[PDB]
Design a protein around this ligand. Sequence first.
Ligand SMILES: [K+]
Ligand SMILES: [K+]
Ligand SMILES: [K+]
Ligand SMILES: [K+]
Ligand SMILES: [K+]
Ligand SMILES: [K+]
Ligand SMILES: [K+]
Ligand SMILES: [K+]
Ligand SMILES: [K+]
Ligand SMILES: [Mg+2]
Ligand SMILES: [Mg+2]
Ligand SMILES: [Mg+2]
Ligand SMILES: [Mg+2]
Ligand SMILES: [Mg+2]
Ligand SMILES: [Mg+2]
Ligand SMILES: [Mg+2]
Ligand SMILES: [Mg+2]
Lengths: 96, 274, 85, 63, 131
Amino acid sequence: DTKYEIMYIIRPNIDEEAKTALVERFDTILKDNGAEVIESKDWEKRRLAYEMNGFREGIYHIVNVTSPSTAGAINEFDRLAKINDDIIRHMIVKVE
Amino acid sequence: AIKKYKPTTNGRRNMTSSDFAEITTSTPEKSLLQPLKNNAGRNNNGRITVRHQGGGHKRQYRVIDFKRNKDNVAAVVKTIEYDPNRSANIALVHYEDGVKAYILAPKGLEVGMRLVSGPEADIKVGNALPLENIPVGTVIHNIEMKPGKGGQLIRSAGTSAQVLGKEGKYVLIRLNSGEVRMILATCRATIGSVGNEQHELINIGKAGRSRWMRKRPTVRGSVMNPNDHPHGGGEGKTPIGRKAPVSPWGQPAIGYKTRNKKAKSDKLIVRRRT
Amino acid sequence: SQERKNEIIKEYARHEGDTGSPEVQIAVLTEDINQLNEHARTHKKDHHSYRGLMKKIGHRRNLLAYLRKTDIQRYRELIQRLGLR
Amino acid sequence: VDYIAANHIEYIDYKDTELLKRFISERGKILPRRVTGTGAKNQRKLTIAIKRARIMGLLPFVS
Amino acid sequence: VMTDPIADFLTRIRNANMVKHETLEVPASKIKRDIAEILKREGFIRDVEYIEDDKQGVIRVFLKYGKNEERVITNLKRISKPGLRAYVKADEVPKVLNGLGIAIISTSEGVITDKEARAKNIGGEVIAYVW
RNA sequence: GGGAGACUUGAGUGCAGAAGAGGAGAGUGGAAUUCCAUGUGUAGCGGUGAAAUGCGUAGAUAUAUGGAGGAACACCAGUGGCGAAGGCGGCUCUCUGGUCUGUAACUGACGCUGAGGCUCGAAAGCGUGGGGAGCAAACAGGAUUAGAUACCCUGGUAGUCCACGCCGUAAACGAUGAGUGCUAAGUGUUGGAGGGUUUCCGCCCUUCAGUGCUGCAGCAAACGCAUUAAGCACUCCGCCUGGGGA
Ligand SMILES: [K+]
Ligand SMILES: [K+]
Ligand SMILES: [K+]
Ligand SMILES: [K+]
Ligand SMILES: [K+]
Ligand SMILES: [K+]
Ligand SMILES: [K+]
Ligand SMILES: [K+]
Ligand SMILES: [K+]
Ligand SMILES: [Mg+2]
Ligand SMILES: [Mg+2]
Ligand SMILES: [Mg+2]
Ligand SMILES: [Mg+2]
Ligand SMILES: [Mg+2]
Ligand SMILES: [Mg+2]
Ligand SMILES: [Mg+2]
Ligand SMILES: [Mg+2]
């Protein structure tokens, strides 16, 4: 399998329970599409080096995952994350 | 795809048509067929009101569900079928409760897709949602201008529109024509673009084929008599010989805009094109 | 896949532990050639990868030529097993 | 001195913004490996990590 | 790929001789040994020895330089090549430098010099000239 | 040369590692330009050797806020890397080729070259359909000039980008075919490998394969080439036989 790391920025305004619901929704997306969510953490809450979508602040949440390369879980996360408004920016990188 | 005919005859020469590969059956739904008569461009007065129409092949109307307001259950795409009345193809879909219907076939539609309608529907090709629930940047079709009236815009083969943004109770849309305008957010649309994108590339090939498609010959005004057309008359071939080319009823034909100047939709039209 | 390569090595091995041999090499080359043909059919414009495929094809033909030169019976058996011309 | 080598870290996360900040000049521009005394291999890895950090907003593009 | 180890042997000798190296080494082959021993008994090369390894063996040649480091071997030349073979009849055996040099020939009587070949009145394949 | 054996060096596979703008597909980030909208704000801005065209009192340039969208990927960056060549530089992921270094388990000459064929092949160009900010043949205007169908200036269409399909040419160059072996050193640098140290980092020694520079013998008409030969040799291929006409 291949190991991915997904760090995405939730807009800072979000409520705690809304944030928790969003986190679990995206974790469910990964699992159902065929990935193995081996870790999901709320990494930090940081100011942005530059304004992103008009925001200078955000909540960085990390998700370490490991999925078959052919599985479309990563691709589906990209699609749904891009569509969703809460998440500002998502980075998916292979981790060796 | 488009198949080109070998030049076995002058008529057949340069002719092209669609292979109809996507079409999966040639047996329309008896339940949804309705009769249609060829008006041949004649109104209740019986006068020819629109020229160059009539003749051609007999057609049965297929009842398309432009409303897509059955949000209760998903509809499974049973077949892709050819529709004589529209450039796009249609899709027969079964609702899990047993209601059969036809929809426009979006680009990429496949038999077995389980489409859904309503606010909770996912953003998938063929699903129908109110415009408010469609994320910006989405490509859509079968847009309705008045809620509940059914899709009216973006229904020809290969056409598409894009959702640009929201404001107030309206949603900004770029139409296939390139015009940018506001549309009531409560209106619905279908995710995707109209399939059969290749339709425009067909080369009709011969006059008889136009006749099949119900187009009667078009006669240039320049070869009519003066009492028939403003361009008529004159010895030999003649130029326009007027201030500008005009229709048979004197309406200028090149660049003269005909949209009503006090149209109520000017408030909603943001940027015009065409 | 390394796992796939090992399994095919075992199937066509002339004897125990035989990795390099006309039979094993040709079979592995054939599998990669078929697999890479699908990739090329998907990516018509991947000319660099396609040259790799052509080098593989040439190498496999050379091995087959050598094998037919040496042992015709093994050559006939191998083409039968692998469905080659 | 190759600071990366001295620290003996063969994995250069694009999240260790503190680690990255010691390889960029003011204005956010990246420093030459000849300036920093580091190796070529680690220089390439630093470039990738810094660029990833910039795209995710951890580091500034300019200023 | 190497196509004429005999020519390679001759060229190894020529290059080593040109730089006045004391010794040289070559992969061992029967015909190479025949040429080496011919040169040895003709006094061109100082000494010859053979080593056995697990590839094909090795042959080491110690070059001969006269007084004042003068080169004994003026040059070597490959006559018969894989591209074109050179066969000479008994009366066609050549003389290198009017006999001062030698011509190594392969015959049904073995690998012999030009003098020996014409003494036996047999032809063969002219492997090389040396002088 | 032919037949029957044997061998492992060449060749390839296995196994353990290394780097990389190699290719393809779909996404995505920031600076800038231009344009759009609206503030502020008034007399120019722009440009040249000097000018003028041009834009600006219908309020320009500038200026702040955003918005739009096209293209290229600053810094890193390096006779650095990769590719057979053309060529490949933002980042991510999917697919994918090749190369190098070890080990020596495997096959046991299976190799080299390669007419004819086939594939790839910068830029421009062509076809269909897209897209189109900047730049820019053509072209327009202002200058220069004896003239200026130019150099210069202000604009600017095709094109430059994308998908598909053609086209098959370049100073497509190292103006140096490929394979192999041999023949002083010195010094850089790329990716590995081993040892001797070193607490580690690191430094010393050996070596594999690139990449530079310097430089022996040798070669050369000279210029220069010199283990990345144009030196010493063998194999195969392509090609040359005074200039013009061409
Ligand atoms: K998003
Ligand atoms: K025709
Ligand atoms: K139709
Ligand atoms: K007509
Ligand atoms: K007339
Ligand atoms: K690879
Ligand atoms: K074009
Ligand atoms: K070196
Ligand atoms: K002549
Ligand atoms: Mg008409
Ligand atoms: Mg008439
Ligand atoms: Mg009239
Ligand atoms: Mg008239
Ligand atoms: Mg007339
Ligand atoms: Mg081009
Ligand atoms: Mg030429
Ligand atoms: Mg070197």
